[PDB]
Amino acid sequence: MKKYRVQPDGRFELKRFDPDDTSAFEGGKQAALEALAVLNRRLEKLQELLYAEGQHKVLVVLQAMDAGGKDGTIRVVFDGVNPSGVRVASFGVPTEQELARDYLWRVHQQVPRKGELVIFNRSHYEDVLVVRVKNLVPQQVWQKRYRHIREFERMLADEGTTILKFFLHISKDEQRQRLQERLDNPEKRWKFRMGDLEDRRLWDRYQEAYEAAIRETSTEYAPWYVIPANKNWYRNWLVSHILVETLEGLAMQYPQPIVIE
Amino acid sequence: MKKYRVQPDGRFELKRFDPDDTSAFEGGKQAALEALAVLNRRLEKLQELLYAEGQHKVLVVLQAMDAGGKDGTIRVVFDGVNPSGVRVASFGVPTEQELARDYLWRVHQQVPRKGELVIFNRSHYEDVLVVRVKNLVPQQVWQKRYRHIREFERMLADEGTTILKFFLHISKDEQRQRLQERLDNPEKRWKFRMGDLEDRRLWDRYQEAYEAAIRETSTEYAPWYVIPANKNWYRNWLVSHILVETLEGLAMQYPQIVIE
Amino acid sequence: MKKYRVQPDGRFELKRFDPDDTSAFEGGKQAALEALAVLNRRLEKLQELLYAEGQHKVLVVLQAMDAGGKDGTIRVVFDGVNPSGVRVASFGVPTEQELARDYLWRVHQQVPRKGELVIFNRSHYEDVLVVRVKNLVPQQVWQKRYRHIREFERMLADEGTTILKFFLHISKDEQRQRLQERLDNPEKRWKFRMGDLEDRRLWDRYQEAYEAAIRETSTEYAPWYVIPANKNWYRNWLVSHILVETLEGLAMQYPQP
Amino acid sequence: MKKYRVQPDGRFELKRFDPDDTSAFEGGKQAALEALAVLNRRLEKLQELLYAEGQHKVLVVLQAMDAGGKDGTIRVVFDGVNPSGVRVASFGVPTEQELARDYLWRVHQQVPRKGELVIFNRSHYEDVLVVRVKNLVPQQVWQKRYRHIREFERMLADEGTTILKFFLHISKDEQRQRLQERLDNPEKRWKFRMGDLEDRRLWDRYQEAYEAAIRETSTEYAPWYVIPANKNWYRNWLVSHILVETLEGLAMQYPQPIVIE
Numbered sequence A, D: 001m002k003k004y005r006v007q008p009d010g011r012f013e014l015k016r017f018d019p020d021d022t023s024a025f026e027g028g029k030q031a032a033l034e035a036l037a038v039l040n041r042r043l044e045k046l047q048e049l050l051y052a053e054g055q056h057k058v059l060v061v062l063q064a065m066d067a068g069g070k071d072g073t074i075r076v077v078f079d080g081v082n083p084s085g086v087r088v089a090s091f092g093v094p095t096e097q098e099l100a101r102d103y104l105w106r107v108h109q110q111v112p113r114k115g116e117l118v119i120f121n122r123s124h125y126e127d128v129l130v131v132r133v134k135n136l137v138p139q140q141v142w143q144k145r146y147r148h149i150r151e152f153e154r155m156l157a158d159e160g161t162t163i164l165k166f167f168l169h170i171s172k173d174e175q176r177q178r179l180q181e182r183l184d185n186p187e188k189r190w191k192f193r194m195g196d197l198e199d200r201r202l203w204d205r206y207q208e209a210y211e212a213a214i215r216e217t218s219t220e221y222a223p224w225y226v227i228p229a230n231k232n233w234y235r236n237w238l239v240s241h242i243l244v245e246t247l248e249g250l251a252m253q254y255p256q257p258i259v260i261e
Numbered sequence B: 001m002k003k004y005r006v007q008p009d010g011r012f013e014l015k016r017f018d019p020d021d022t023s024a025f026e027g028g029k030q031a032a033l034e035a036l037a038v039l040n041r042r043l044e045k046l047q048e049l050l051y052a053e054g055q056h057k058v059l060v061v062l063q064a065m066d067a068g069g070k071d072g073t074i075r076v077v078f079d080g081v082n083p084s085g086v087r088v089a090s091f092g093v094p095t096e097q098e099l100a101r102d103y104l105w106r107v108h109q110q111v112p113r114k115g116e117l118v119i120f121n122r123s124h125y126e127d128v129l130v131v132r133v134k135n136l137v138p139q140q141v142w143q144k145r146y147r148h149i150r151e152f153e154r155m156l157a158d159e160g161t162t163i164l165k166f167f168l169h170i171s172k173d174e175q176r177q178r179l180q181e182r183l184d185n186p187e188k189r190w191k192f193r194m195g196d197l198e199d200r201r202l203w204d205r206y207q208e209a210y211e212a213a214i215r216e217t218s219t220e221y222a223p224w225y226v227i228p229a230n231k232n233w234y235r236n237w238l239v240s241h242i243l244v245e246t247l248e249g250l251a252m253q254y255p256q257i258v259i260e
Numbered sequence C: 001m002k003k004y005r006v007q008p009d010g011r012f013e014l015k016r017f018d019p020d021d022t023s024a025f026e027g028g029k030q031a032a033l034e035a036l037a038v039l040n041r042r043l044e045k046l047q048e049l050l051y052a053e054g055q056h057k058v059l060v061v062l063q064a065m066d067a068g069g070k071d072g073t074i075r076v077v078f079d080g081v082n083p084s085g086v087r088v089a090s091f092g093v094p095t096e097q098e099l100a101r102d103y104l105w106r107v108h109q110q111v112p113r114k115g116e117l118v119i120f121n122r123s124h125y126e127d128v129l130v131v132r133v134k135n136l137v138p139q140q141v142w143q144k145r146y147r148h149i150r151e152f153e154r155m156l157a158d159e160g161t162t163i164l165k166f167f168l169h170i171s172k173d174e175q176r177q178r179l180q181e182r183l184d185n186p187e188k189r190w191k192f193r194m195g196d197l198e199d200r201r202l203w204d205r206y207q208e209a210y211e212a213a214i215r216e217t218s219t220e221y222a223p224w225y226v227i228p229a230n231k232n233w234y235r236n237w238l239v240s241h242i243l244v245e246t247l248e249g250l251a252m253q254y255p256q257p
Ligand SMILES: Nc1ncnc2c1ncn2[C@@H]1O[C@H](COP(=O)(O)OP(=O)(O)OP(=O)(O)O)[C@@H](O)[C@H]1O
Pocket: A064, A065, A066, A067, A068, A091, A092, A093, A094, A122, A123, A126, A127, A130, A131
């Protein structure tokens, strides 16, 4: 798509994106599930081509507020790939060894190699999101990181990495409903922690942090896509569509090449 | 389904397992696909429990002759899991850095952590398989590795790893048909390399190497399962059944407010 | 000099080794410093041969009670090597990621490669030492680890690693004097941690843990050497002599041009 | 200390540095060996402070033509440190796995952590040196790497790394004598490769590549120091002096906190 791609003009406004927007797809849930199965079959062939050709490196970054759909998006990408060529690198609370080096160290370690597709569940962007919102480093420090990120991603892209960054955009009320469903389910309540409730108060600070991160780092070589994600079906379809179209654009070729006894 | 577990008596004979055997399933392909969907739903809940509890470490080892089903088995495992808690560690031709350390170094690095399920696509067993068949090290060296492997796996099991080793067993003629299909498909012919044709001449040497590896290392703490795998549907169902039953046996427990 | 190698008979008694023993050296500190300088020049040639030949893997394990000499021994090895071919892998308090895998995982990661000498400052032995003494896992668990260690080390040795394990043996009163010296030095008191005082009470439990570990794991392919270490000069000389003699035994040669 | 620091004005000229220059030291070899022992004793205390304080990260980069002194410089640094807090990360011919990721991947992996001093024996600079000289990638690719390097180093410095880059400067005739000495010594002959002979014909191309890299990447946060290195004694003294003075400038403090029974 083009309406969801954030232009590299530094004029991005998050208020312009409605989490309930479903306008790029004509039809609803059922037609989208059918379109998604078609995309999965296309993705299987494209991922196998990615691997067999062994030249491109594909990085998919997923960022979202908790219950925003990162987990669900990973599952629908995996529905259309060979797990031997695709992996998830997730980024959680940094360890002492990770904090003992620059914040990009643990992230750079996990970049896709040639013929590989890697999904970052959270990423280096957390170092300008939770780090900024919770003041884990002073502003003097984290404000410099927007340039570090643009330049790290420029180097990655110049050296052969195709970068797709998706912000799965849900509303506060949608998050409320999804978090209540987790609490009410005995098989999901383990996902609740001490402080999750008081973190909801920081909703607006996170939205500002996301808007600043996206505006600062959406570039030609590393675009951000804002995905209206209140509807799981639309989020899954749209992310799959963008990923498949991006892979098609690489114009990948099988390597150039008998009766077995 | 216990007929496929190799007893730790060192009396295993590969000739006793028919790759065409489908006797553990009282039906065919259609009924097995339905049973497999049920196993996939059970596996999703079990894997999430594995992660949420965060105590067990699960290692699934896949070994098979080329076209034997490792790739297809990985896909049916992933059909029943969350990719955030399961990963594939594949073992290919060792690099100079890997050969500069003991053969278990590159393998030990990839073991599952607590709350994780790892699939080894090939494994430390290649160090008594291709290494043995192609004489990549003298026999004096690779013969000692059966004990190294039993002891490495004993340490893993003692320290909390549940180990499942599957030998996906196909016939020489089944491999021939499957390799011919790869060659004839323009989207799969990239898999073929000249040298595969010479590798076919070594079929019997590999069967002997597999029999000796299985006989030497199938233990109570790290059993081998011989999977008749000429039928993709049977291999998928049986591996999924064993994995789900193993995870059920762990009796995992979930760890021990109105939002405005 | 072979009186310090613990025979693989499972009959080792730590009481038979006196931390004040200097009997293998017929002289004192000054003559030993000169002998150590000769061993240092020998080690430089042997380490370069190790690297150039690029076939052997050398693992040196250091274990000692705090202030026992691991740090001083590392310096004395480094005085006779090219730092480009020798490295220190130190083992501290396990992290969550390290504890999430078997205790050998973090250790196996660090093994020397061909043409390399690695010094383990502490090692997998801590998993039968501080783990046993502080009951970090039940005895049913840590008792099984003696066999794991023998078998891990057998595999390493079979696959080409020369293993040397040194237990730098100091007395309780020597440790007390050395720890008091750290506290009294403004440039060293940063080493003192809260809990080091209460850990002094566990001295005898550590001595028992060391004896049991050494008795269980000193083998023909992976010997333990008990180093009387109350005298820094004697510990440095003896470790250096054993290391140099071990490397000489490998009969290494420069690759042919 | 100032005459050897390459100013970040992009006007660097390698012809202005004489490999035989010993002007920063009054006296010769013997007085310098004594001054070096004094610097080693100072370095031991400073490195221990670096470790005990556990806050700064120190990166020393060594680049030189073969026989230029990287090996000798490493030994002289190690003469004044505790090996438990200092390590050498050397960069050789990239492996298939290293080439399957961006050239900075293998380098970033090895950066010093808090309280650590790391010496890079060769570095990311090889990706604009041999890579450029032997045309291992097209110019369109390697020309973009000067910016990647400035920006990677900016990020490292902003996030707490003190960076020292030393170009150990030897003349063509000095290299010739040193390489001849290796061939003539039975204990050093093993270092000789046959491609080494034909690599001598590329001397001028390497000098141009070094001048371009120094000019492009000597910045305020990551300076290059050109070390006249025809005299081993002067190279050892000068590198040790710069390192010690840099560590002194960090104003490191021991962490602030009894009769043992
Ligand atoms: N750079 C970072 N600094 C601090 N915390 C971080 C950083 N990167 C990730 N985290 C945090 O790690 C945690 C991971 O927690 P967990 O695995 O339970 O997922 P989660 O709570 O569902 O995350 P999310 O809110 O993104 O959905 C998140 O709370 C995230 O904010």
